[PDB]
Amino acid sequence: DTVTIRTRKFMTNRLLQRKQMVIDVLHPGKATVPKTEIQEKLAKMYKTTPDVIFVFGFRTHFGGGKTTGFGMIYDSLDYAKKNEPKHRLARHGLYEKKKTSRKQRKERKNRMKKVRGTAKANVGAG
Amino acid sequence: MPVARSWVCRKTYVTPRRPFEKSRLDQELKLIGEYGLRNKREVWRVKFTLAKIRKAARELLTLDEKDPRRLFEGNALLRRLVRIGVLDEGKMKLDYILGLKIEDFLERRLQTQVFKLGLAKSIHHARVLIRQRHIRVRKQVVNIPSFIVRLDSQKHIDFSLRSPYGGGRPGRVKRKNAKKGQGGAGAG
Amino acid sequence: VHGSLARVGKVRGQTLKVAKQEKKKKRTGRAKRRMQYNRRFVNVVPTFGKKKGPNANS
Amino acid sequence: MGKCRGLRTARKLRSHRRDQKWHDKQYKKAHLGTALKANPFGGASHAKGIVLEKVGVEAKQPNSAIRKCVRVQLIKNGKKITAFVPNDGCLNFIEENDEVLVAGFGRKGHAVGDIPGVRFKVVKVANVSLLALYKGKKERPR
RNA sequence: UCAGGGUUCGAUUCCGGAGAGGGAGCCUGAGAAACGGCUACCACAUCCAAGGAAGGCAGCAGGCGCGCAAAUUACCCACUCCCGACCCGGGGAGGUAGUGACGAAAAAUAACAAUACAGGACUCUUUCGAGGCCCUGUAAUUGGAAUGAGUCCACUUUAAAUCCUUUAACGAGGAUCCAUUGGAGGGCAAGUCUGGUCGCAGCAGCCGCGGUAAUUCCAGCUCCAAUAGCGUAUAUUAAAGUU
Ligand SMILES: [Mg+2]
Ligand SMILES: [Mg+2]
Ligand SMILES: [Mg+2]
Ligand SMILES: [Mg+2]
Ligand SMILES: [Mg+2]
Ligand SMILES: [Mg+2]
Ligand SMILES: [Mg+2]
Ligand SMILES: [Mg+2]
Ligand SMILES: [Mg+2]
Ligand SMILES: [Mg+2]
Ligand SMILES: [Mg+2]
Ligand SMILES: [Mg+2]
Ligand SMILES: [Mg+2]
Ligand SMILES: [Mg+2]
Ligand SMILES: [Mg+2]
Ligand SMILES: [Mg+2]
Ligand SMILES: [Mg+2]
Ligand SMILES: [Mg+2]
Ligand SMILES: [Mg+2]
Ligand SMILES: [Mg+2]
Ligand SMILES: [Mg+2]
Ligand SMILES: [Mg+2]
Ligand SMILES: [Mg+2]
Ligand SMILES: [Mg+2]
Ligand SMILES: [Mg+2]
Ligand SMILES: [Mg+2]
Ligand SMILES: [Mg+2]
Ligand SMILES: [Mg+2]
Ligand SMILES: [Mg+2]
Ligand SMILES: [Mg+2]
Ligand SMILES: [Mg+2]
Ligand SMILES: [Mg+2]
Ligand SMILES: [Mg+2]
Ligand SMILES: [Mg+2]
Ligand SMILES: [Mg+2]
Ligand SMILES: [Mg+2]
Ligand SMILES: [Mg+2]
Ligand SMILES: [Mg+2]
């Protein structure tokens, strides 16, 4: 195939239970590579799993060909579940998002600020 | 509000003071024809980047020799000039900078080298090819006709590796017509 | 002379109308300059000392 | 024939130049303020007004014509000023008692050309240009 | 902006100060003479069952008014940081997108052959004339090739999206996938063309044009300058050795 991975400025971070590096993808002729299709080749490179691997960034140059991004590879799964930002755990579902606007949260708080002892119906009856 | 931005920007030309002067209009029109540029402004850029070099050269030449500042910045300015093929290493001194003409910065343009190194039929054909992404510097497509070619980049200019002119699928015209033989001349 | 001497818009009204005759799309951009260089510098068929202007009619 | 040249005369030089600037007309009217106070605009480039009526003013000899002017009263000041209309037959677009936006003429305070004592010209009649009302690109909103 | 000396500007993202309709008084606190705190007078303005109560956008959006003059009642704490009892909550601070020809950078609207005419160095012929290589237009077609502006699957982007970049599929014959704005007496680049008007209508920064034969008005044609921009009004700087 044309696609190829090459790492750069590798660093083994023990203070956060991961190894981080920069990723080069030499993929001429084709569109950008999907993130899924990258992370499994990193696995085969480091012999762990396509589950403790996270990748992001990935801007493509002018002219086609290369792209460069950032990648991290955790030791356990749960260390990733602790040390990752939540939205990056959401990308490949491992977390979920809730309340449907900033307005509703704001305006509930302002209605509740005008009652004492039990804020009651403003939450319990919406 | 405070904000995370750079407002820094600048102009890169200066209009001439005499707006309708024949000795000027005919020379600049000559320079537009001989290198295939677009406006007058494409010439006033080169005039600016030369008239600004010629101020640093002069202000250095009005320092006294052996100065630290003059030595350092002169050795830095000559290096920068030599490195783009505007000056000869057999000169390498400030009192020669004042002898450079505008038609040496114009000569090092990629449009000029793509014609003069043989890849195109004319100075106008060259500007079309560069703008159509047919040419490559060193493992890198480029699309800007005004790109200035560094001295040792010179022999890297060649046709792109994904392009009809040398190893590439025929374009959307050579393919629409070869299909007219199998879709317009076989059963159509 | 007839009507008000001060009649406003007199000459713009009584002037007979004529349409634009043309079809030909003119050139634009670099290709126009390519034209003006060739016509002013490349071929200039030789003439007597009484030189002529590019729009001359008389 | 004499101008103090000595090494500590700076007070005299500065206090004397500061005085002599006041004889230069163009400087004087920038800084007395009586010009800006008297300006029929507000010290702006343009002003809106309402067309009181239409007049013609005979040009200054030798050349001869009747020059087709509005007389306007400005919105902000309320003061009255005469203005020129700038092309062949435009005086028919200007109905009476609509607004207009007058501008300057071109010599910063002074009557231009053959017209006696007219210092402003119209650009817009009713939010539409004269140059568009006259070239056909637009028509009056009514 | 500027030879050298200077002239003019600095409400405006960094630092210092001052103020929350105008003046005044104070509580609490390490810190306030605090207004997203309280009390009173002045000016405004809202609710009423006429007893009473309540208010401060020169925060972010939005509206009226004023004027020559200035954007959406959108999204989110993911980034930079701050606050808290705090690894967890909160932030119109701040980030993101919308409107945007204030302004700055890069840069398309045609490239190339054949043929026909046109023109020059060269060859030959006493010339005429012919051969001819180098260019320009210009025609008829063509001739085929090239590519994005667009339409549009996916990836990528990001908090979630948009944009740009990366890519499949469609997408050019010129009568459109159409370049404009101001001029053509002088200053100042460009017509002593043609038709119209007749000191009228109008032009003209200045000198000056128009009175039946207009290089200056109105229009066609042609030509000029800058060009994705150009004209006008105004303040200001150089020209000004006219401070
Ligand atoms: Mg504001
Ligand atoms: Mg006196
Ligand atoms: Mg006077
Ligand atoms: Mg006179
Ligand atoms: Mg200076
Ligand atoms: Mg300030
Ligand atoms: Mg103020
Ligand atoms: Mg402000
Ligand atoms: Mg401040
Ligand atoms: Mg201090
Ligand atoms: Mg107020
Ligand atoms: Mg305390
Ligand atoms: Mg207070
Ligand atoms: Mg406050
Ligand atoms: Mg309060
Ligand atoms: Mg109160
Ligand atoms: Mg407030
Ligand atoms: Mg506001
Ligand atoms: Mg208004
Ligand atoms: Mg504005
Ligand atoms: Mg407004
Ligand atoms: Mg935060
Ligand atoms: Mg939080
Ligand atoms: Mg903000
Ligand atoms: Mg711009
Ligand atoms: Mg177009
Ligand atoms: Mg594109
Ligand atoms: Mg997503
Ligand atoms: Mg025109
Ligand atoms: Mg004119
Ligand atoms: Mg004409
Ligand atoms: Mg002129
Ligand atoms: Mg001339
Ligand atoms: Mg007649
Ligand atoms: Mg006549
Ligand atoms: Mg005539
Ligand atoms: Mg000055
Ligand atoms: Mg003066």
From Swiss-Prot, chain B:
Residues 108-182 form the S4 RNA-binding domain. One of its GO terms (molecular function) is structural constituent of ribosome. The modification Phosphoserine is found at residues 153, 163. GO terms for biological process: ribosomal small subunit biogenesis; translation. The modification N6-acetyllysine is found at residues 66, 116, 155. Component of the small ribosomal subunit. The ribosome is a large ribonucleoprotein complex responsible for the synthesis of proteins in the cell. Part of the small subunit (SSU) processome, first precursor of the small eukaryotic ribosomal subunit. During the assembly of the SSU processome in the nucleolus, many ribosome biogenesis factors, an RNA chaperone and ribosomal proteins associate with the nascent pre-rRNA and work in concert to generate RNA folding, modifications, rearrangements and cleavage as well as targeted degradation of pre-ribosomal RNA by the RNA exosome. Belongs to the universal ribosomal protein uS4 family. This is Small ribosomal subunit protein uS4. The gene is RPS9.
UniProtKB/Swiss-Prot annotation, chain C:
It comes from Oryctolagus cuniculus. The chain holds residues 76 to 133 of 133 of the full protein. The gene is FAU. The modification N6-succinyllysine is found at residue 50. Component of the 40S subunit of the ribosome. Contributes to the assembly and function of 40S ribosomal subunits. This is Small ribosomal subunit protein eS30. It is found in: Cytoplasm; Nucleus. Component of the 40S subunit of the ribosome.
Curated annotation (Swiss-Prot), chain D:
The modification 3-hydroxyproline is found at residue 62. GO terms for molecular function: structural constituent of ribosome. Its main location: cytoplasm. Residues 1-20 have a biased composition (Basic residues). Pfam families: Ribosom_S12_S23. Hydroxylation at Pro-62 affects translation termination efficiency. It comes from the Eukaryota. InterPro entries: NA-bd_OB-fold (IPR012340), Ribosomal_uS12 (IPR006032), Ribosomal_uS12_euk/arc (IPR005680). Component of the ribosome, a large ribonucleoprotein complex responsible for the synthesis of proteins in the cell. The small ribosomal subunit (SSU) binds messenger RNAs (mRNAs) and translates the encoded message by selecting cognate aminoacyl-transfer RNA (tRNA) molecules. The large subunit (LSU) contains the ribosomal catalytic site termed the peptidyl transferase center (PTC), which catalyzes the formation of peptide bonds, thereby polymerizing the amino acids delivered by tRNAs into a polypeptide chain. Component of the 40S small ribosomal subunit. Part of the small subunit (SSU) processome, composed of more than 70 proteins and the RNA chaperone small nucleolar RNA (snoRNA) U3. This is Small ribosomal subunit protein uS12.
